[PDB]
Design an enzyme around this catalytic site. Sequence first.
Site, PDB file in Angstrom:
ATOM      1  N   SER A   1       0.810  -1.206   0.000  1.00  0.00           N
ATOM      2  CA  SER A   1       0.000   0.000   0.000  1.00  0.00           C
ATOM      3  C   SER A   1       0.847   1.261   0.000  1.00  0.00           C
ATOM      4  O   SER A   1       1.827   1.364   0.733  1.00  0.00           O
ATOM      5  CB  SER A   1      -0.850   0.006   1.215  1.00  0.00           C
ATOM      6  OG  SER A   1      -1.914  -0.886   0.981  1.00  0.00           O
TER       7      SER A   1
ATOM      8  N   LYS B   1     -10.075  -1.224  12.354  1.00  0.00           N
ATOM      9  CA  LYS B   1     -10.444   0.029  11.705  1.00  0.00           C
ATOM     10  C   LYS B   1     -11.437  -0.196  10.554  1.00  0.00           C
ATOM     11  O   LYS B   1     -12.295   0.652  10.316  1.00  0.00           O
ATOM     12  CB  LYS B   1      -9.189   0.777  11.250  1.00  0.00           C
ATOM     13  CG  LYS B   1      -9.404   2.199  10.754  1.00  0.00           C
ATOM     14  CD  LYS B   1      -8.117   2.926  10.515  1.00  0.00           C
ATOM     15  CE  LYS B   1      -8.407   4.358  10.148  1.00  0.00           C
ATOM     16  NZ  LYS B   1      -7.164   5.117   9.921  1.00  0.00           N
ATOM     17  N   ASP B   2     -11.329  -1.316   9.819  1.00  0.00           N
ATOM     18  CA  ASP B   2     -12.300  -1.698   8.791  1.00  0.00           C
ATOM     19  C   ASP B   2     -13.703  -1.926   9.378  1.00  0.00           C
ATOM     20  O   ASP B   2     -14.684  -1.633   8.707  1.00  0.00           O
ATOM     21  CB  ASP B   2     -11.804  -2.873   7.928  1.00  0.00           C
ATOM     22  CG  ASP B   2     -10.677  -2.533   6.936  1.00  0.00           C
ATOM     23  OD1 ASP B   2     -10.574  -1.333   6.521  1.00  0.00           O
ATOM     24  OD2 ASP B   2      -9.877  -3.472   6.576  1.00  0.00           O
TER      25      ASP B   2
ATOM     26  N   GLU C   1     -28.579   3.713 -15.610  1.00  0.00           N
ATOM     27  CA  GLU C   1     -28.472   3.907 -14.174  1.00  0.00           C
ATOM     28  C   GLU C   1     -27.478   5.013 -13.847  1.00  0.00           C
ATOM     29  O   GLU C   1     -26.587   5.295 -14.640  1.00  0.00           O
ATOM     30  CB  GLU C   1     -28.033   2.585 -13.586  1.00  0.00           C
ATOM     31  CG  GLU C   1     -29.145   1.591 -13.718  1.00  0.00           C
ATOM     32  CD  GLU C   1     -29.816   1.392 -12.376  1.00  0.00           C
ATOM     33  OE1 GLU C   1     -30.794   2.125 -12.094  1.00  0.00           O
ATOM     34  OE2 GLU C   1     -29.349   0.506 -11.607  1.00  0.00           O
TER      35      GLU C   1
HETATM   36  C1  HEM Z   1     -14.046  -5.093  -7.005  1.00  0.00           C
HETATM   37  C2  HEM Z   1     -13.393  -3.957  -7.021  1.00  0.00           C
HETATM   38  C3  HEM Z   1     -12.228  -3.766  -6.142  1.00  0.00           C
HETATM   39  C4  HEM Z   1     -11.834  -4.322  -4.940  1.00  0.00           C
HETATM   40  C5  HEM Z   1     -12.483  -5.349  -4.036  1.00  0.00           C
HETATM   41  C6  HEM Z   1     -10.600  -3.687  -4.596  1.00  0.00           C
HETATM   42  C7  HEM Z   1      -9.912  -3.967  -3.387  1.00  0.00           C
HETATM   43  C8  HEM Z   1      -8.736  -3.305  -3.016  1.00  0.00           C
HETATM   44  C9  HEM Z   1      -8.089  -3.473  -1.775  1.00  0.00           C
HETATM   45  C10 HEM Z   1      -8.617  -4.346  -0.667  1.00  0.00           C
HETATM   46  C11 HEM Z   1      -6.955  -2.723  -1.782  1.00  0.00           C
HETATM   47  C12 HEM Z   1      -5.966  -2.597  -0.646  1.00  0.00           C
HETATM   48  C13 HEM Z   1      -6.585  -1.663   0.432  1.00  0.00           C
HETATM   49  C14 HEM Z   1      -6.948  -0.260  -0.040  1.00  0.00           C
HETATM   50  O1  HEM Z   1      -6.078   0.545  -0.473  1.00  0.00           O
HETATM   51  O2  HEM Z   1      -8.121   0.178  -0.049  1.00  0.00           O
HETATM   52  C15 HEM Z   1      -6.892  -2.061  -3.035  1.00  0.00           C
HETATM   53  C16 HEM Z   1      -5.829  -1.238  -3.405  1.00  0.00           C
HETATM   54  C17 HEM Z   1      -5.848  -0.696  -4.709  1.00  0.00           C
HETATM   55  N1  HEM Z   1      -6.798  -0.750  -5.659  1.00  0.00           N
HETATM   56 FE1  HEM Z   1      -8.463  -1.694  -5.555  1.00  0.00          FE
HETATM   57  N2  HEM Z   1     -10.232  -2.856  -5.562  1.00  0.00           N
HETATM   58  C18 HEM Z   1     -11.165  -2.833  -6.511  1.00  0.00           C
HETATM   59  C19 HEM Z   1     -11.264  -2.075  -7.671  1.00  0.00           C
HETATM   60  C20 HEM Z   1     -10.232  -1.233  -8.068  1.00  0.00           C
HETATM   61  C21 HEM Z   1     -10.253  -0.341  -9.151  1.00  0.00           C
HETATM   62  C22 HEM Z   1     -11.392  -0.117 -10.130  1.00  0.00           C
HETATM   63  C23 HEM Z   1      -9.002   0.279  -9.167  1.00  0.00           C
HETATM   64  C24 HEM Z   1      -8.443   1.233 -10.140  1.00  0.00           C
HETATM   65  C25 HEM Z   1      -9.026   1.834 -11.166  1.00  0.00           C
HETATM   66  C26 HEM Z   1      -8.212  -0.190  -8.095  1.00  0.00           C
HETATM   67  C27 HEM Z   1      -6.910   0.236  -7.935  1.00  0.00           C
HETATM   68  C28 HEM Z   1      -6.307  -0.055  -6.715  1.00  0.00           C
HETATM   69  C29 HEM Z   1      -4.994   0.499  -6.412  1.00  0.00           C
HETATM   70  C30 HEM Z   1      -4.078   1.347  -7.283  1.00  0.00           C
HETATM   71  C31 HEM Z   1      -4.728   0.117  -5.163  1.00  0.00           C
HETATM   72  C32 HEM Z   1      -3.489   0.445  -4.385  1.00  0.00           C
HETATM   73  C33 HEM Z   1      -3.795   1.753  -3.651  1.00  0.00           C
HETATM   74  C34 HEM Z   1      -2.820   1.956  -2.518  1.00  0.00           C
HETATM   75  O3  HEM Z   1      -2.863   1.272  -1.455  1.00  0.00           O
HETATM   76  O4  HEM Z   1      -2.065   2.913  -2.615  1.00  0.00           O
HETATM   77  N3  HEM Z   1      -9.009  -1.102  -7.446  1.00  0.00           N
HETATM   78  N4  HEM Z   1      -7.998  -2.454  -3.785  1.00  0.00           N
HETATM   79  C1  HEM Z   2     -20.658  -7.406  -8.949  1.00  0.00           C
HETATM   80  C2  HEM Z   2     -21.660  -8.204  -8.724  1.00  0.00           C
HETATM   81  C3  HEM Z   2     -23.001  -7.828  -9.227  1.00  0.00           C
HETATM   82  C4  HEM Z   2     -23.580  -6.622  -9.564  1.00  0.00           C
HETATM   83  C5  HEM Z   2     -22.948  -5.227  -9.618  1.00  0.00           C
HETATM   84  C6  HEM Z   2     -24.925  -6.950  -9.933  1.00  0.00           C
HETATM   85  C7  HEM Z   2     -25.828  -5.999 -10.379  1.00  0.00           C
HETATM   86  C8  HEM Z   2     -27.153  -6.269 -10.656  1.00  0.00           C
HETATM   87  C9  HEM Z   2     -28.106  -5.288 -10.991  1.00  0.00           C
HETATM   88  C10 HEM Z   2     -27.883  -3.809 -11.170  1.00  0.00           C
HETATM   89  C11 HEM Z   2     -29.285  -5.935 -11.170  1.00  0.00           C
HETATM   90  C12 HEM Z   2     -30.580  -5.227 -11.474  1.00  0.00           C
HETATM   91  C13 HEM Z   2     -31.303  -5.250 -10.085  1.00  0.00           C
HETATM   92  C14 HEM Z   2     -32.742  -4.774 -10.069  1.00  0.00           C
HETATM   93  O1  HEM Z   2     -32.927  -3.553 -10.254  1.00  0.00           O
HETATM   94  O2  HEM Z   2     -33.764  -5.507  -9.879  1.00  0.00           O
HETATM   95  C15 HEM Z   2     -29.095  -7.319 -10.927  1.00  0.00           C
HETATM   96  C16 HEM Z   2     -30.105  -8.246 -11.082  1.00  0.00           C
HETATM   97  C17 HEM Z   2     -29.776  -9.590 -10.888  1.00  0.00           C
HETATM   98  N1  HEM Z   2     -28.583 -10.141 -10.537  1.00  0.00           N
HETATM   99 FE1  HEM Z   2     -26.962  -9.236 -10.159  1.00  0.00          FE
HETATM  100  N2  HEM Z   2     -25.150  -8.255  -9.773  1.00  0.00           N
HETATM  101  C18 HEM Z   2     -24.030  -8.855  -9.379  1.00  0.00           C
HETATM  102  C19 HEM Z   2     -23.792 -10.181  -9.055  1.00  0.00           C
HETATM  103  C20 HEM Z   2     -24.739 -11.170  -9.298  1.00  0.00           C
HETATM  104  C21 HEM Z   2     -24.464 -12.546  -9.197  1.00  0.00           C
HETATM  105  C22 HEM Z   2     -23.156 -13.224  -8.795  1.00  0.00           C
HETATM  106  C23 HEM Z   2     -25.606 -13.207  -9.527  1.00  0.00           C
HETATM  107  C24 HEM Z   2     -25.651 -14.690  -9.514  1.00  0.00           C
HETATM  108  C25 HEM Z   2     -26.543 -15.115 -10.367  1.00  0.00           C
HETATM  109  C26 HEM Z   2     -26.586 -12.224  -9.878  1.00  0.00           C
HETATM  110  C27 HEM Z   2     -27.887 -12.486 -10.178  1.00  0.00           C
HETATM  111  C28 HEM Z   2     -28.788 -11.467 -10.474  1.00  0.00           C
HETATM  112  C29 HEM Z   2     -30.210 -11.796 -10.802  1.00  0.00           C
HETATM  113  C30 HEM Z   2     -30.849 -13.168 -10.868  1.00  0.00           C
HETATM  114  C31 HEM Z   2     -30.820 -10.612 -11.077  1.00  0.00           C
HETATM  115  C32 HEM Z   2     -32.246 -10.344 -11.547  1.00  0.00           C
HETATM  116  C33 HEM Z   2     -33.305 -10.334 -10.472  1.00  0.00           C
HETATM  117  C34 HEM Z   2     -33.342  -8.924  -9.918  1.00  0.00           C
HETATM  118  O3  HEM Z   2     -33.494  -7.902 -10.608  1.00  0.00           O
HETATM  119  O4  HEM Z   2     -33.169  -8.754  -8.719  1.00  0.00           O
HETATM  120  N3  HEM Z   2     -26.014 -11.000  -9.713  1.00  0.00           N
HETATM  121  N4  HEM Z   2     -27.756  -7.496 -10.638  1.00  0.00           N
END
Ligand code: HEM
Ligand code: HEM
Lengths: 85, 244, 244, 383, 383, 55
Positions: free
Chosen positions: E206, E228-229, E272
Amino acid sequence: YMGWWGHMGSPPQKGIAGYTISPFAARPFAGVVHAAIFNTFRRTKNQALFVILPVSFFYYVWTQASEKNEWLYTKAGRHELAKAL
Amino acid sequence: MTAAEHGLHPAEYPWPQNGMLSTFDHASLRRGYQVYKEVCAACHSLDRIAWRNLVGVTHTTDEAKAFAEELEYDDEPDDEGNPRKRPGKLADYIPGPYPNEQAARAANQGALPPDLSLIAKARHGGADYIFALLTGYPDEPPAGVVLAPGMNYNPYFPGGGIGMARTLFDGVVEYEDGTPATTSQMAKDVAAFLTWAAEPEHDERKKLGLKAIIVISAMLGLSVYIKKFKWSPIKNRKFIYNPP
Amino acid sequence: MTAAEHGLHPAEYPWPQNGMLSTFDHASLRRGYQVYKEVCAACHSLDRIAWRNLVGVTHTTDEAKAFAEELEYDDEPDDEGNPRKRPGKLADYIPGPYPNEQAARAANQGALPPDLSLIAKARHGGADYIFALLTGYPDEPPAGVVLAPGMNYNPYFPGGGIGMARTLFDGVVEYEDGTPATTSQMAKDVAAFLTWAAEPEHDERKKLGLKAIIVISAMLGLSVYIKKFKWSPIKNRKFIYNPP
Amino acid sequence: MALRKKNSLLNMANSYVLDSPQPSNLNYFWNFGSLLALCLVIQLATGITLAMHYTSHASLAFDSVEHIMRDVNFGWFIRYAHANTASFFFICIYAHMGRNIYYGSYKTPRVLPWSIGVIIFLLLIITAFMGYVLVFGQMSLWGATVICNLVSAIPWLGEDIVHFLWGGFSVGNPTLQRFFALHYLMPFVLAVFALLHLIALHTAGSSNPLGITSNVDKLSMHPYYSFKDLITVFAFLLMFTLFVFFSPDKLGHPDNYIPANPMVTPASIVPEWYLLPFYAILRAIPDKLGGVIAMVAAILILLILPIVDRSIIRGNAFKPISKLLFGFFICNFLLLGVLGQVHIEPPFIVLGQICTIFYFSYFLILLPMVSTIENIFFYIGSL
Amino acid sequence: MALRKKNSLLNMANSYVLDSPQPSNLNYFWNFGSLLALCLVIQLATGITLAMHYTSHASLAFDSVEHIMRDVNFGWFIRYAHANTASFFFICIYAHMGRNIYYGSYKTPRVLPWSIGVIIFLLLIITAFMGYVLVFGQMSLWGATVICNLVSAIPWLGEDIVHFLWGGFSVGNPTLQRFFALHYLMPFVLAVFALLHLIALHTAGSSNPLGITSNVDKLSMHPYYSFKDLITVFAFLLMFTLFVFFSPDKLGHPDNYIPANPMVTPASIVPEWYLLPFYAILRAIPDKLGGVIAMVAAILILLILPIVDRSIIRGNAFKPISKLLFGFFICNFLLLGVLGQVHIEPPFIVLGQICTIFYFSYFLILLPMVSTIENIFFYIGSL
Amino acid sequence: HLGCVPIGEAGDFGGWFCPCHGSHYDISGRIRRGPAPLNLEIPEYDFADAETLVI
Ligand code: HEM
Ligand code: HEM
Ligand code: HEC
Ligand code: HEC
Ligand code: HEM
Ligand code: HEM
Ligand code: FES
């Protein structure tokens, strides 16, 4: 129990010279006909009993069981079936 | 279980489609459709088959359109929301003889004639079972068999008593290609047609399989050469040991 | 867009259910069902609601069974496969006035009355929009508005011309609890009922939310204490530097 | 430093597929691991594609599978590939497990990859069972009914658990829709555990057919085992081709082409072939709960091989008596399979019980005795 | 040696969640990473559960969602949790990306985790877009139609690609069933990339709010950052609770409670909220293909921050001019969001174009200029 | 214009009138008055028979 290249975890090696030749310099299929016939025969002959004995035993058991089952469900096997249930 | 409870096992007949490289005989498929249409369709549906499915298999586009256009199908309601009918189209499915199961059973002394679209896959034996069953009604049941009322003796059917009577008799159909419509010929054709209905990809599948077999075999042979080529330095390695 | 193209925004009325801790008024829900049944149900369905849904919300099991039993629903076919009807049960859905859209439009000069089961969620404004719309038909359209044929002026409806005429007038319903059925009272009750129909989990949801808010807040407070407790050795650390 | 070593992401791949040091003498039975990875990749690709065309609702499920066969371009191939590769997956996993048992891969220091492997095998069984229900033919429904009713044997809460699994009072639409969601998920869980057992293995490296250390003589995974893996990949694809294109229904049950009917019961309700040995073991115990326990124990007993094998030597290459016993154990396992699909009739009832006793006595009696005696024979015989 | 260090599996977990050495001065903006992990876990649990009750066929989809709301026990909660957590996921991801841009987390040696992060963000957008279609209400259908028709802009093959994506000539049942299968898959792909960006980060550790090395002063991840989390987890759960239980439809569009109707077009078709800035950027360019390229470029341009930031110092804590520019960039991004949902009318058409120019000029002109000048001011100012 | 369906026979060029923003189409379905930029698009259609067209 395993390291990596350069420290694999071998006891110290000394005194072995190893030699080999390039894949481009060798005939890959050298001695293939001898191997395919004589080598395979030797290897198969030495393992044959370990396959034949269990396979033949369990095939015989199955054969006897399936033939009895078939016979019990004929007219001739009526009486023996009645006792068996 | 007794052999009777299993049913007699059908003979293996030499179908044209038996054979890794063999298609259906499409002339037999066409004749089999005609047996379906004139005999079986009185009691049995073929619900998974649409008119378009016949096109370029047994019939031309025009023949199949003509079959579809002779029937009436439910349209969308009119402007007052009253029901309407339309003539059939190629996308329509072949319509069955009965509106529901209850009607089907009422017309068949309680028995329900199955849909025939998957019957060649849904029975052990496939085409051979269909052929054996249709041609295997003895004139007289073996002495001692007591059939339930409305049952017919057929040894191929498990248990022996089937609710379907014999239906194929010499000359019930007049084939349009001049083939003599004997019981055996009609059973062979309709069994072929039903096999096609269950597996319409059959001809293409086996041709693609031939291509795959050839390519995969060549790749297998080359992969052996390449493995041996690359391994030869390891296989050929020799050692001289001089104990320190 | 013009304000007319948007529609006038409804007032925020003080509904009983507004309020983090507030349920619906169930007496209003019951009265609103009676307005639905006697006025709206002539043109509008409520297809997502079953008779069992009313039970223990607006009606007892017996009242709801009586409503169901007065209607006829399609049964399974009889033994000859002919259609049959049965009396309704609690599992049945409330039946709509028209068999299809075409019939619905034919009865409403081309307009299709929407199903009302989700209408409180499907319109900006919710209960307030339904209340405003039903009570917001002016006697005369504002000077200069030209209504299309079969349209009625209502400022809350986007564009101003709605195919639904005013339907609530003082005393069209006689409430069974003796409440004066004025236009405003009936609109308030039916809007409450339709809001319940769109979100029947409302009362339970808000009570579970109260429990969650309390537990989560306590956990938040304790998590702050614990974080501070564990971090204090780092926060309190002191240094003495003596440059080598 | 080479990039494949310096960059941490590349270095992880490098450590598993390229510079990974392997014994120089792995035989062809070490190729089943990559075949299992191939089956997993095929099942993911075909399975996700089938999910784009399949409908999980009980009113449409069976017909959506017919639409796949009839209307979707190459749908017949994707469906047959998915159904046949499920059988190939089990052939390869039985081969891989048989390799592991013959060569002593379960012994220290490889107890952890073996123990995670046993869980992989349980997840594969669950995955395959749920996928088979999704067709919603007669075997789908009746197999779900009888297998899910085994849970009723759990004392006190068993019936409640069954109704909870079904989401109702019998196998129906709720059960089918939940099995779809779980069948889609379970392969991802399976891939994670497959990865875990390899990371656990990486501490000792692969064992080898001689049972000795290979730390003296290592070969890079690539190119040697990459090119040796291609041979068995193409052999597998030839077998795949013969079933998928020339005999696509040889491994299946015709009753699964009849739509599920809760009223009519099929003549014989059996699991798919790869579950048959466990079904024979269950039949052998007359008690319901007894039978369920025995059937689960038949898989969990694999976890004790590290203890009951008392040999000072790893693997069977040099142990003639152990090789005979292993041969009998394997053939008995195949006979149990056959007995899993016969009718419950004489004389197969008693035979199934004797085979069940043999199955368990391998772990509990014979392997501990034989491995003890062979230790003594190696010592005395070489003095 | 302690087991958590000795065992290779335990040691991997240990390295990431327990002994992982962290800077001792991470502020609360370093908590969004664990919030994003929490959102991913909630979306997996709620999403898999919804899949057990949802039917992907167009004739049943919308009604299966109403069955979830009305009949499934706690179905309303699982549905609202899933729909609201999709919005929270984007709030947390924008916060996490904003933290990364302000504190210079994209600079060497953290270019790789940042670059993989940009792909994570693209996968989240695709995942969320497909999930929204699954409801099959009016916004579902019309949003799918308009967004998928952007692909028609691809020259030569665009139209063919659209028909291929739809599986027909308009958005319909084939499209819905494929979006279901891909929506289920994409979160698993997203979890893998999330793991990859953390493994890439682990080589540098980090960064921290001061922008200096923390190799001088490390704290274990546990117990310090674990506890802290928990504070931000409970703050998040309070916000979650207020939306899910007290205002479950505040973030949604009422038109999605009307079943999809290909005949009637909704008054305004907008994405959205979390996609709105990208939609405003697309509207700004009059050309169809131009607009699509600009919209994609608006995300891919994040990949050049490592190059265009010319500062010799990491992060903005000590850079007053960079902090002002960052403030304007963020507020402009929010204004683009607002303009994404207004009608295409004066004067918002021109305003959207000016905001679009500002968005791109941050990366291409302003940040390179300002970061150059601040380098000189730090040097001269401290002489 | 935006994508409502014009009410036919209505208009000011007596073809089609979109009620949404008041755009008037002709008997050719050409735009004459109102916000709409283009004439109503023509699908790909052929007269198979003189009594049936396929679209
Ligand atoms: C599912 C989405 C994501 C998850 C679960 C995730 C999770 C994490 C975690 C747990 C860390 C270490 C702790 C922290 O700094 O907050 C981290 C660091 C980082 N993430 Fe993400 N991340 C995600 C999406 C992204 C995205 C979209 C970006 C960049 C566009 C990104 C770039 C980074 C960078 C550069 C670090 C290092 C920052 C630092 O500690 O200086 N991550 N991420
Ligand atoms: C990053 C993870 C995910 C995101 C951001 C996401 C996002 C969404 C969104 C925006 C909708 C529309 C919800 C509504 O307005 O009704 C939706 C619907 C749905 N998602 Fe996901 N989803 C995720 C993961 C999953 C996963 C792992 C499943 C496993 C099947 C899933 C199953 C569904 C189903 C069945 C629906 C339709 C029923 C409903 O609208 O509630 N999604 N999801
Ligand atoms: C007028 C009635 C009738 C006609 C004509 C008829 N069937 Fe049937 N068929 C039945 C009935 C009833 C059954 C169910 C019998 C039973 O299950 O006992 C049946 C069953 C079958 C079965 C399934 C037997 C099984 O294993 O379940 C096949 C195959 C079959 N018919 C094919 C045909 C073919 C091919 C034709 C004609 C070319 C035909 N049928 C003509 C009434 C008919
Ligand atoms: C005899 C006809 C009729 C009666 C009675 C009727 N409506 Fe309607 N309603 C309609 C028609 C037609 C529309 C469609 C109007 C349109 O879209 O132009 C409609 C539309 C609505 C709308 C939706 C307007 C919108 O925003 O799309 C609501 C809400 C509504 N009605 C509620 C009610 C309630 C509540 C009642 C009575 C208590 C009621 N209606 C009585 C015919 C009726
Ligand atoms: C280890 C991986 C898998 C195994 C062993 C497996 C096994 C099976 C089996 C045995 C069936 C019944 C096939 C039939 O007879 O018709 C099936 C069906 C199905 N599987 Fe899988 N499967 C796996 C992975 C997947 C995955 C990842 C998906 C993704 C959704 C999936 C989707 C399906 C679908 C939709 C069906 C029903 C359609 C059909 O029967 O063909 N499978 N699976
Ligand atoms: C999805 C299923 C599986 C996959 C993809 C898989 C893959 C692999 C691979 C690639 C290897 C290294 C190469 C090899 O030896 O073949 C291996 C080794 C191993 N696997 Fe598996 N495996 C799977 C299931 C199992 C099962 C079910 C078990 C045990 C019950 C198991 C136990 C082992 C053991 C003990 C080894 C080390 C063997 C050795 O090299 O001596 N695996 N596996
Ligand atoms: S929508 Fe046709 S006139 Fe504006």
